[PDB]
UniProtKB/Swiss-Prot annotation:
Activity regulation statement: Helicase activity is inhibited by ATP-gamma-S or ADP. ATPase activity is stimulated by binding to DNA. Helicase activity is stimulated by SSB. Helicase activity on branched substrates is stimulated by PriB; SSB increases stimulation. PriA catalyzed duplex DNA winding is inhibited by CGS 15943 (CHEBI:131351).
Result for mutant: K156A: Loss of ATPase and helicase, allows assembly of primosome and replication of phiX174 DNA, complements a deletion
Motif (DEAH box): 246-249
GO cellular component, one term: DnaB-DnaC-DnaT-PriA-PriC complex
Organism: Escherichia coli (strain K12)
Effect after changing H403A: Binds and unwinds replication forks, strongly impairs PriB binding, PriB stimulation of helicase, moderate decrease in DnaB loading onto forks
Any one biological process term the GO annotation gives: DNA replication, synthesis of primer
Region (Helicase lobe 2, N-terminus): 308-351
Name this protein carries in UniProt: Replication restart protein PriA
Gene behind the chain: priA
EC number in record: 5.6.2.4
Region (Helicase lobe 1) residue spans: 127-302
């Protein structure tokens, strides 16, 4: 009598044991229908089969039905999901079901209702592009990870297409991932045209039957290329030969609710498991990717080859609605010409800092010298790093001025205060934030990078009002995000024959990172920022895990996190290189009627930190408050 160890779609980090009735057989990765709870039945996925259970066998119930004779996961996806459930510390049943098409989550048959033998290659690459294609061509049957770095217009997409052509010429399949925002009509029609082979485009418009039909075609070899967003990483393939991740830095590859996986990292694990090349492409590569190049874990392939810009010093200026006087003037010049203007601000929920508008002084924690977070309503400064607290001072202590201003505020009523300064001028946001156009003069308000397929040809002035927020944020990654945005808009501004203008406002135009970025470029900024991350022992040079908790009384969550902190620190694996910081309020400390708190775990070794967390979680029942609180583990947070 075998025992099936079954994963169910429930938020418990365990499997559930069932007996197989005589005559019924099943294997790992097959779905089953099983009893669950008092008198309910659910679909589960068999994780393994053995002849034993931790419970007495006479306490086990029987599997009702086996749904699959062949598994619904290929090996490499199965190995990736089991590895990820452990590394992200997420319930195995939630991981496995989240990776399936909806119809298969529901228990329906994995069924509905070639190009290989005769592949026809249907173009002049430059030297640099041919070197890149050739390097991946020679690397085709073992694992290797490549950063393809080149500004927009340097020909990355043509390298991708030639690599794919070579992969299809081998009779192998390909996976192409693009950001959520990336599946444009032009992009898609481009791919489909180049390949005389079936291409499946997993775009968010697809209904569940079409998503299953594409899954089946990739699994059985009928589709040559699957193009999709972060979840396409779970696509089964018969014979996968390459993975391409376009725009590898984009934050849409990190899932930030439920299972918080990072598709970029999991795609590299998948390439290592399938023993194939993965190409990560970007005009503004993430620091962790540049760190992987410097450490020789990734290989670099570089592709190489005019807007007016002004940096405005805010110090002592008579601002109107957070806009420098000289910027207001420029905006009037462009608006009078019937052109459009984009203002970029920090993201809503940004945790503001406090600085002197006259001399530039920034409020800093005296204990640990990190920049303070300003809480205006409560007239408090609070340190996100060490949790110290001070009243807001009446005077700058460096110069004596009373003109202390918050930095990093979003479009807080700014729509209302911009209408006075620009009467009769329509105002409109452009952020994809729609709670889950083409004309003359207009002011556009943005808070993040535009999509690669998202252009506003009638914009001739971009203003960056997010500089101070980025530089003096309590989030160490904000400068990196700002550098990536700046490089995009500067590149987009007046690509040719359309004179563009970019204006940056800051109280610190001389800031050394900003100077490197503006006059030496992204790559130089990135080398400098990476060196500073290393000195500070921050990601990508150490590993971080944030434990986030919330409550309805501003007491349960910090108490639970204090206790979790002590339990972590008491781990037999906890050494001198482990830091556990906090508890501290989240950078958005309260949303709804909930208080949000966190601790940060930091270690140089990703695997050691994983083992420390594993030992802590095996003892989580030692902290009974763990069930009085909603809490999650966020491994490798992008915060
Ligand atoms: Zn501090
Ligand atoms: Zn001052």
């Amino acid at each position: 009598m075998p025992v099936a160890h079954v994963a169910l779609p429930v938020p418990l980090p365990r499997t559930f044991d069932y007996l197989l009735p005589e005559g019924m057989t099943v294997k790992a990765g097959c779905r089953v229908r099983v009893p669950f709870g008092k008198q309910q039945e659910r679909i589960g996925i068999v994780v393994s089969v053995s002849d034993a259970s931790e419970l007495p066998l006479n306490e086990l119930k029987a599997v009702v039905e086996v749904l699959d004779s062949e598994p619904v996961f290929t090996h490499s996806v199965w190995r990736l999901l089991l590895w990820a459930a452990d590394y992200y510390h997420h319930p195995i049943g939630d991981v496995l079901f989240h990776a399936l098409p909806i119809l298969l989550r529901q228990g329906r048959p994995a069924a509905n209702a070639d190009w290989r033998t005769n592949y026809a290659v249907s173009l002049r690459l430059n030297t640099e592009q041919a070197t890149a294609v050739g390097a991946i061509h020679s690397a085709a049957d073992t694992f290797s990870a490549w950063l393809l770095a080149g500004v927009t217009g340097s020909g990355k997409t043509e390298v991708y297409l030639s690599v794919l052509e070579n992969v299809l010429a081998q009779g192998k399949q390909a996976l192409v991932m693009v950001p959520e925002i990336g599946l444009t009509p032009q992009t898609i029609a481009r791919f489909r045209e180049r390949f005389n082979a079936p291409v499946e485009v997993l775009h968010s418009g697809l209904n569940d039957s079409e998503r299953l039909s594409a899954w089946l075609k990739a699994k059985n070899g009928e589709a040559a290329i699957v193009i999709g967003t972060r979840s396409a990483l779970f696509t089964p393939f018969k014979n996968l030969g390459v993975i391409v991740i376009d725009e590898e830095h984009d934050s849409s590859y990190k899932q930030q609710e439920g299972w918080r996986y990072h598709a970029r990292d999991l795609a590299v694990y998948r390439a290592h498991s399938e023993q194939i090349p993965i190409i990560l492409g970007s005009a503004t590569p993430a620091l962790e990717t540049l760190c992987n190049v410097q450490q020789k874990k990734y290989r670099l392939l570089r592709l190489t080859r005019p807007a007016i810009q002004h940096v405005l010093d805010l110090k002592g200026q008579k601002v109107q609605a957070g806009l420098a006087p000289a910027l207001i003037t420029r905006m009037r010049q462009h608006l009078q010409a019937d052109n459009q203007v984009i203002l970029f601000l920090n993201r809503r929920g940004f945790a503001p800092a406090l600085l002197c508008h006259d001399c530039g002084w920034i409020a800093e924690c005296p204990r640990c010298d990190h920049y303070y977070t300003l809480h205006q309503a409560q007239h408090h400064l609070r340190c996100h790093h060490c949790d110290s607290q001070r009243p807001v001072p009446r005077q700058c202590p460096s110069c004596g001025s009373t003109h202390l201003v918050p930095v990093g505020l979003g479009t807080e009523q700014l729509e209302q205060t911009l209408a006075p300064l620009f009467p009769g001028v329509p105002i409109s946001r452009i952020d994809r934030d729609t709670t889950s156009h083409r004309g003359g003069a207009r002011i556009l308000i943005g808070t993040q990078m535009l999509a690669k397929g998202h252009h506003f040809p009638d914009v001739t002035l971009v203003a960056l009002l997010d500089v101070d927020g980025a530089l003096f944020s309590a989030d160490f990654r904000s400068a990196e995000r700002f550098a990536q945005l700046y490089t995009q808009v500067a590149g987009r501004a007046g690509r040719a024959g359309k004179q563009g203008e970019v204006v940056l406002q800051t109280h610190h135009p001389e800031h050394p990172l900003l100077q490197t970025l503006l006059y030496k470029g992204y790559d130089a900024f990135a080398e400098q920022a990476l060196a500073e991350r290393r000195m500070m022992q921050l990601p990508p040079w150490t590993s971080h895990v944030i434990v986030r908790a919330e409550d309805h009384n501003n007491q349960h969550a910090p108490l639970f996190l204090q206790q979790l902190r002590n339990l972590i620190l008491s781990s037999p694996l906890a050494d001198e290189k482990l830091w556990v910081l906090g508890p501290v309020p989240a950078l958005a400390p309260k949303r709804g009627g909930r208080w949000r708190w966190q601790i940060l775990l930091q270690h140089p070794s990703r695997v050691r930190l994983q083992h420390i967390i594993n030992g802590t979680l095996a003892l989580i029942n030692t902290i009974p408050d763990s069930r009085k609180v909603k809490w999650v583990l966020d491994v490798d947070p992008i915060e």
